[model samples]
Target: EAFEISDFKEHAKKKSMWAGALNKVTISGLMGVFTDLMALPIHRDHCPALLKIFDELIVNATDHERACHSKTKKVTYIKISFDKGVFSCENDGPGIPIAKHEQASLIAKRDVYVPEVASCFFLAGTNINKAKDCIKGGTNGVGLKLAMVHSQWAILTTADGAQKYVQQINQRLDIIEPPTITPSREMFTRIELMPVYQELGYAEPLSETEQADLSAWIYLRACQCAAYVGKGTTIYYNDKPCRTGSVMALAKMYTLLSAPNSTIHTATIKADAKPYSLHPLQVAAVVSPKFKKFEHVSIINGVNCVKGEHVTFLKKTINEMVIKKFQQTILRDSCSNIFVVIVGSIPGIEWTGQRKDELSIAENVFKTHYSIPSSFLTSMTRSIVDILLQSI
Candidate 1:
C-alpha cells in the first residue's frame, strides 16, 4: 500500500497508528504536550539513548492498549519525573508471564543471527507486538535493552492481578519475589529506570541548554503520542500536570520558545494530503548578532536538526535560484538569517532521522515545486526577475 492519507484518516478516527504518527490533535494541541515534556529534568549528559528509550516505550504503551482492546478501558497512565531523574510507565494489561519475563533482557540468545552482539534485538514490547510496531518501519527490539544498558540500573515489575514478577536489568539478575500485595482492579506492567547517557542517537554529552532543548522536543512528541491514543494518560513533569491538546493550552506554549520575529505560514501545495498535509510552518529571522551561529539553518519537526551545510543549501537556493521577497535578505546579512520550522507533514516529505537536515523524500518536493535548483542566480533574466519581484 502507498499509505493513502484519506484512508488513513478514516481509520485513525477510530484508532491512531500506534501514536506519534501526527494523525490526531490540533497544531497548538500538539505544541502544548511537547512543551510540557520539554520542561522535564533531563541531565545535561544522558540524552542519546535516553531519548530513544522514551520514544520506544511511549509507543509500546499504546500498543499495549491495542493488544488488549476494550471499549470501556482507558489505555495507560504515564508519569515521568526528573525531580530524581527517573522515568517510568504503567499500563493495565495481561502482565508479563513468569517464563517469558525470565528469558528476556541482558542475556545473549544463540538463536539470533547477529555476531558479537550480546543483545542484538531485545524484545521490549514483547515478541508479538515487536513485529506489528516494525511494520511501519520505526519500532525496534533494542528499546528496553538500550534502556537497560544505558541506565544506572533498570527493572520491569509486572503483575497479573494475582501474581507478580520483578525482572532486574543491566545484564544482571532476576529475582522472582513473592506477590507482597493484593490484586488491583486488573493486571498492570511498569518499567522503572535511572539512566546514564546524556546525548541521544550518538555518544556525545550535551550541554545544559542542549539538554533542555532536546528534552522539550522529545517530551512534546511523546505527549502528542498520548493525545493521538485519545485515552486518559496522566502525564507529569516535576509533578506538574501536562494537558494533552486544547486551543488555550497550546497557545500558552508559544512563549516557551524565543524567536527574533516569528510568523506562521500555511500553504496547501497538494490537496491530496489535506487536513494532514497543510505544511504549517513557523518562521523567524535571526536578527541579533548574538544569535551566534546565525548563519546556520535549523530544521525542526518533532526534533531539531541544526547544520550549517543544510543552511547553506537553503541560502544558496534562495539567493541565486529561487524567487522571493526576501531576495538576498537571508544572504546579504547574517543578522537577517531565518530558521524554518516545518511543523506537520509536507505532503510527500519524510525526515531520515533525528538530524533531519539530511532529508530523504524532500528532494522531489523541491524539484516539482520550487525552481531554485534548476536556475542559479546567474540565470536570473528579465521574466524570472519580474516573477520574483512581483510575488506576494
Candidate 2:
C-alpha cells in the first residue's frame, strides 16, 4: 500500500466495520458518514442511534417528499458535499411535490396512519417489529433532532416541479419563514449539518444516562429500513455516485425478489407537465410486447430559434431511409420484449392523487388516431412492431 498512513488507516477501519453489517447493513441512508465515525472509542452504542437518525431522514423523504420514492425501481442518488464542518446531503428528486406546509391540512399526520396505511412505504420503524418504537425513525425523527443537539446548525432544502422550500432543525423543526418559489427545471432535495469541526481541549463525553440509553439501541434497528435498491434507492457522496451495499445486499435481495416468477418495474405518467400547444395532431406511440424493432418518421422540431425569424427550426428526413440507410435498429420487435412501460407527459393533464380515470382511460382514447396514423404515436407503436416483425 503506497498510500499515506491516514489513507491506509481509513481503509482498514472501514473494512473492519463493514464486515460486521454484512447482513444487517443497509446502504440507503447516512452513507455511514455519521454512524461509522461514532464507532470510535466507547461511543459504539450511540453509533447505532446516529445511523438511525439518517435512516428516518431518508425514509421521510422517500415517502412524503416528492416522487413516490417508496415504490421507485430507479436509483435515488444521495450526494454529500462537506466543508470542514458541514455535511450536506442532496437528493435528485422532484422537490416536495406540494409542500404540505401543513402536512395535516392535506392529510392529517395521525391520518398518515390508518386511513391510507397502504401508502406507508416510507414511514419509519415499520422496517421491523414494534412500529411504535420505530416511529419518528430513530427516536421518532429525533435523529435530526439529536444531530442538531450535537452539531451547531442544520438546514433542509426540498424542491418540487419548479419550487423549493428550506428549513432548519435545531432540537425542533422550524419551517422556513418565507418559502422560495423559483422556476426550476428539475426536482431535488438536500439536508446539511454543521458539526463541531475542531474541538477545544476536550468536548463533553457521553454521560452515564446516555451510556444506558445507548444500549436501548433504538437507532440500530434503523439499518433495516435503509433498504434501497435499484428497485428503489440510490446515493451519492460529494458529487460522486455511491453504491448501495454490494454482494451481501444482492444476496439478500435475490432471496427476497426470488419469490417465484416475479419482476420489478417502475413507470411514470405525466400528461400535464406543461401546456399542450395546439399540435392539433397529437402524436403517441405504444409498442407491442412482441416487437423487436422500431422505425420513426416523425420530424425533429427546430430547437434553434433565429432572432426575429422563426420561433424554432425543424429537420425532416424520410422514414425508411432514417431506419435502414442511417443504420438505426431500435425498431426490432421481439427485441423490444415485454417491457410494459406506460409513460405519458401531456400538457394540461392532472397530477393530483386522484389518477383513477386519468391516464389509463386516456391511454385507450389516445390509441385511436384520425390521420394517416403513420406519424401518430399510437401508429408509431404499431409501426415499430410491423417493421421489426417483417425482419423476423
Candidate 3:
C-alpha cells in the first residue's frame, strides 16, 4: 500500500517544489553580483559598476547587430540619455524576440512559470551563441540583468519590424504587467529605468558639487565607450553625437581640452596584413608639455582597461625610446604629459577580473617575431621624439 497510486501524486508535488527552490537560488545569485556596490561607498570610492552597466548595454547592442548582420558592416545607432533620475538607452539592433520568449515560457509551464520578454532580465546567458565571436565587453549574459536589478523600475520596448512588445519590470524582478503586443514598422530595442542613486551611495538630495561630479563622471564614461566603438558605431549622449571618428581624434580632443596652450604631438601605428591572424592592432599616442602626468587609455575587445599587459608594454617601450633618442637621463621631464591609446580585438583575450579593468595577454605576443614590426615602433618613437624636440 505504501507504493500505491496515491503516492505518485506526492512525487509531482515534490518536483514542483524543487523547481521553485531552483528559481529562488537563481535570483539570489543574481543579486549577489552587486553586493559589493551596496556595501561600499559607491559614489565616493572608485566604483566602475555604474559605468559598467552602460558598457554592458552598449556591448549587447553592438554584438547583436554584428551577429545578425555579419556579412557587411552597417551603421548601428545607439542613443543614451540620463535626465532627472531617468536613464534611457536605445539601439537599432534586432529587437528582443517576444514570440520566442513566449514559446519558451509555454513549453516550460509544466515545471515553472518562466517569464516572457522579461525572462532575459531574470535569466543569465540568454544572449545568442553567435555573438560570442564578436568583440564584446561582456562575454557572459549578466550585464543587462545587472542593469535591471539595480534600477528601481524599468520599461523595455522592442520591435522587430513587424510586431512590437512592451513590458514593465520592478527591482524585485517582478513583471508588474504582462507584455502588450501590437503591430509596428520600426526595428529597435529601448530600455528606460529610474536608477536607484541611493544604492549607488549618493545623498537623497544631491548637493551642487555632487551633481557636477556625477555629470562629469557619466560624460567621461560615455566618452570612453564612444571612443572604443569608433567609426561605424554612433553613440549619442543627451542628443549630442559622441563619435570623434577615431581613437587618435579622441586623444587629440582630450589633450587640447586639458592643455589649450601647449603644442601636441601624436603618432599612430597600424598592423600591416592583420598580424597573428587577429583584428589589426591600432596604437595612437599624444604628448603635450602641459600634461602633468602620463595617461594611458587601453581598450581590448570593446572593454576599457585601466592597466594591463598592453599598457605595461607600451609604457616601457615609450619611455625607453624617448630616453634613448633624446639622450636624457630620465623620461620624467620629457614624457610626463604623454597619453597613449591602444585598441586591439584579439580572440581569447584574458581579463584580470569581471570588471575588465586590466588585460592579461601573454608577454610573448609582444616579442619582435609575433607582434607589431619593430620598424613601426622605431618610426613611431622617432615621430614622437621629433615632436618633443620641436616643442622644446
Candidate 4:
C-alpha cells in the first residue's frame, strides 16, 4: 500500500513525519510507554535508539554542503518516506564526497566494517561546520554509529554536487554500498533503519509510562542539542519542528549546559595530557596556540539522576584517559578543528558487572567536538566557542 503522511505523522507528537509518496509517513501511533527500552535500549543512557537515530539522521539531513557552499542556490528539495517496518529520510543538499573526504562518516560500524569514512561518519567533527550540535557524542560519532547496530537494516544517504551516496549497514555487519548516486542534477540524502528485535522480553511495546519517560529523555536531549545549533538553524525531527527551533531554544540548551544547577555539565578543562585525575575548575581564559580559542571543555553530570553543566577555565583538567584520546582522533578528523570535552558525573552511581557484588563508580557522560564544520572562519572560531562556553 502507498503510505501517506497520516501513516507516520502524529500532530500530537509535535514532531512527526510528512505525507505523500515522496514523503510517506511511516511510524506513527504512540510509543505509549518505553521506560527500560528508553534507558538501556534506545538512547545512550536516558533516551532510546529511535531518539538517537532520528537525531543523528536528521543531523544527516541538515548536515550538508549547502550550509556552506553555493549548492543551496540550485533550487534543491528533499523528502522522506517509511512504513510498517521501514523508515527513510532524504535531503536535496549537495551529496557525499561533498568535500573530498570531509564527511563525518568515520564511526559507522567499528565492530565490523572499517571504511575510511567510518570513524568520522555522523561524527560532526571540528572540521565540519554543517549543523550545530548533531554529532557531538564523540569526535568520531560513536553514538550515531550505534544507531546502525540497533537497527535491523539502517540505510544512510548523502549526495555530492553530482553524485548520490549511501552507507547501508544490515544486521550491524552486512554493510553495503548503496545504489544511490548523485542523481541527474539534484543532490540528496536518505537514512532508513528498522528496529532490531531483542529477546529481553521485547515482545511488548514500550509501556505507557515508558513512552512518557522516553519523551522526557528526548525532550531533554532536544533541548541539549539546541544549545549548539548556533545562529539560525531550524531543527526538526520526523518532520516535526522542535519548540527549541530558535535562538531561544538554543540559549536554553546553552544555559542548562553551563548553569550550576540540576545535573548537566558542559565545560572546558585543562588537560596537559597526563594521568587519571578529578579536578574541578573552569577555563574561561584559554591558553594554547595550536588552536587556541576554539578549544572548549564541558561536563555533563548525571549523579543519581541529577544533571548540570560545568564550564571550566582550565585547559587540562579533563580526565586524561578519555578526553585525550577524543582530542587526538578529532584533530585527525580534519573536517573540523574545534574540540569539546563533554564530561558526565554521577554522585552516587555504582556499576556492577557480571557479578552483582562487584560494583564500581560509574563516571558517566562523554567528550566530543562540535562547530567549525559549517561556514565559520578559523580565526573567528576561538572566540565563538568561548562565547558558547563563557559564564553567560
Candidate 5:
C-alpha cells in the first residue's frame, strides 16, 4: 500500500517500532521518520548546509569514478549551478548501480523500481555500497538524503553506461510517478531541486542585496570545493571553472584578494614517519601579514572543517613555535592571516556531526602521543618569522 495520512498517524503512535522496521519498509515512511527525528537548523544563511550537501555530491562522484574506473586516466567533470530558484549538480562519474538498488527494493517487498528505488538510498544510514576507504566524506549516507528532504521538489537522473533513468519526487518525499528508463550509452548522475528557502528563514522574492550575498557565498564554496578536489577533478560553477588547479594556488589567490599589500610565505610540513594510523600527514600553510586579528581557514579532505581538534592543534602549534622563535608579541600579528590546509590519509577518521564541519579523532590512536616533529615545526615557525620580519 502507498503512504496514507491515516497510516502515518498510526505509525507515529508506534514510532519506536517504526524506527526498527522502517528500513525494510517504504521510502515515504522512511522520510516520515527522518522528518520527525532530524532537525536542520540554518544559522544566518543556507549556504553552509547547502554547500555541505554539494561537498557530499562531489565526494560521491569522485569516489565512484575512482572505484569503477581506476585504470583509466579519465577526468571527472562536476558542474553545479544555482540560478533563479532551482539548483542543479551533474557529474560525469560512473552512474549508480540501478539493478542493485532495485533488487534491494524487491527484497523489501516494495513495488518501487529503477530511479524510484534509487531514492531509497536517501534514507539516513542507507548506502548503496559501503565505502572501502577513509577518503570518502559521507560514509554514513546522510548528506544526500538531507538534501532531498530539504528540497520542495527534486529530480534524480542517472545513466549507468547502458541505460538512463529518471525519477521525480514531491515535497512530501513521495515519488509522483513511475521512473522512465531508456537505453543509453552515457554515464552520469544529476540531481536538480528547488530548495525550501522558507525553512532557512529566507522570504519569498529575496531583495537585491540578499541575492548578491547568496550568489557570492555559493561562489566561494565552489572555489573551496574546486581547490580541495585538486588536479584530477574539474568543478564548474555557473558555467565557469572554479578550481585553481591546486590548494597552493587557491591559497595564493585568497591572499591576493584579502591582503593585497602583504607578501605570502608558504611552507609544507611533512611527518617523519607514519605515526599511528595517520599516514601521509602533510600540512600546507600560506601566511600573509594582515592588521586583523589572528584568523585561519582550514580544509581537510576536500571539506572545510571550521572547528576541530586538528584546527586547535595547528593554531596552538603555530603560535607557540613562532612566539618561542621570535620572542616578540608582534609575531602574533603576522599569524593573523594564515590559511592552514591539512591533508592526512588516516584510517577510521571520525567527524563530529552530519555536516562534518569538525573532525573528531581519538587521542588514543596516536601510539606515540601524536605531535608534529620538532624539525617540521621549526621550519614552519621560520616561515612565519620571515613574514613578520618583512611586515616591519
Candidate 6:
C-alpha cells in the first residue's frame, strides 16, 4: 500500500465537505450590485464582484451547452483564455438566434424577464425550461445581465445555421462577421470581456493580481459547476483544465433536461436546495494556503442555482463556517490536504429556481430552518466523519 497513504490523502482532500442545505439563503441590500451607480466609473471595490461575474458567465456558457443537449450524453467543452487582454469564454451550444438580438439588448434597460434574451436568463421568476419536465441552468436569468452591466464593454456572438448575430452592451444588434464559425448548423456562443482597469476605466488593462484573481475565480466556479454539470463538461481556465470534472465519478451527474427526471428522495421543508434523485447533495468546504477566504455554503437546486454567480448563503441557517469548523475538527490535515467536501444524503426533496445572493427568504422558508435542532446539525457532522473515516 505504498500508494495508499498518498492516494487516500489525495482522494480525501478533493471532497472538502459538502453539506445539504435545509433553508433558503437570503441576500437583501446586496441587490444594489446591479444598480446603475455600480456601473460606469469603476473602482477597486467593484472589481472582485465584477470579476466574479465574469466567472459566472463562463459557468453559464457550460450550462447552455448542457441545456441544448440535456436529453443526450454529449461531450461539451467551454474554453477560457486571456490572450490579448480579452477574457473570452466560448462554447458549442446553438447560438442565440438573430431575431432575438434586440430582445437581449433591451434587458439592460427593461430589467423585465424575456426568455429570448441571454441577459435575462437569471431573472428569478423566469423559467428556462417550460416543457413541464425540463430542467436547465438558466434558472433566474442573472448571470449575463451582471456581465453586461459590469464590463467596460462586452460582445456576445452567436451563430444558428445560416443566421448569425452580434449583441453588444447598451447598443443595437449588428450583423455577424464573415467566417466566424465556418457556417455550421451546430451553434456556438462567444463572450469577450474587456480586462479590468484601475483608472481611466477603458484606458488600462488588468494588472497582475487581477489576472491571478481571475484565475482563482475560474477554478472555484469550476468546482461549483462540476457538482451539477458532472463529467460531461470540461472547463478550462487560462488554457489549462482544472480537475473538477473528474472528481466525482462514483456520484451521479445530471444535465439540464435530465435534472427534472431525476428523483428527489429527501425533503428539507421550505429549504432552498432541491435534492436530485439517486445523486447525493454535495457541498465543498475548500481551504488552501493560497485561499484567503471562502463564500457562504450555497443551497443548490438543479437548474436555477446554476443560473447566477451569487455567493454567500443566507444567515440563520446552516452556514459555511459551521461546515468548515466540522471539517477542521474531524479531518485534521497531514499533508497539503487543503480541501474537503461533505456530501449529504437527503431522503427526498426537489426544488426550483436559481439561488441568488440578494434573495430574501420567504417567511415560511425562513421559519423552517430556525426549528432544526443542534443535534441534527451534529448528526450531519458525524455523517461526514463516517464517510471520511471509512474511505481513509
Q: Scored by Cα lDDT, where does model 5 land?
A: 0.56
Better of 2 and 3 by lDDT: 3
Tens digits of per-residue lDDT for model 3, 1-392: 48655332233223322112211111211111011011011234322344555556666665554454453434377787777767788887566664644555565452222224333433345544524344655555456766665567888888878988787777634445567789998888888887555655555555564555445545555565566563567777777776554666555545554555433334343333333354655666665555567776666776666777666666666667777877762256445657676665655566665566667777656553234446655665665677677767
TM-scores vs. true structure, each candidate: 0.48, 0.34, 0.73, 0.40, 0.73, 0.50
* Ten contiguous residues minimizing lDDT sum, candidate 5: 28-37
The whole-model C-alpha lDDT of candidate 1 against the native structure comes to 0.40
Instruction: Kindly report which residue stretches of model 5 are placed more than 4 angstroms away from their true locations once superposed.
Output: 1-52, 65-75, 100-103, 106-108, 114-118, 121-133, 269-284, 288-291, 327-337, 343-345, 363-392
lDDT of each: 0.40, 0.32, 0.56, 0.35, 0.56, 0.41
| Highest TM-score against the true fold, candidate | 5
Clashes of each: 11, 30, 0, 89, 0, 27
lDDT of 2 at 61: 47
lDDT of 6: 0.41
- Candidates by TM-score, descending order: 5, 3, 6, 1, 4, 2
lDDT of 1 by residue, 1-392 (tens): 59655532233223322222222122211121243322222333332334555655555565555444455545455555442456776666566543333343236432211111212233333343433112122233444454454555566766666766555555211222222334444567777766554312322354455455545655665444433343455555445555643322232233235532333221212322343233333222222222233332222222233332334444555554433534553344322333332222233334444323343443444444433223323332223344334433
- Give the alpha carbon lDDT tens digit for every residue of 41-145 in model 2: 123323432433344344444333222434442226655454443456666755545333234334633323211121121232223233311111111222333
Name the lDDT of candidate 4: 0.35
Residue range 1-392, candidate 4, lDDT tens digits: 89656311122112312111111123221122122112112322222235445445544343342243234343133333334434555555444444334222333322222222442243334423323222222223343454464566776655555655556677653355543334555455556677553311222355554444445444444433333333344334345444443323232233332231222223333322212123222212222223323333232221111112222211222232224334443422221223443432212223232111122432222232111111123222333343334423
**Candidate 1: 10-residue stretch with minimal lDDT:** 111-120
Under the 3 Å rule for N, CA and C atoms, how many clashes does model 1 have? 11
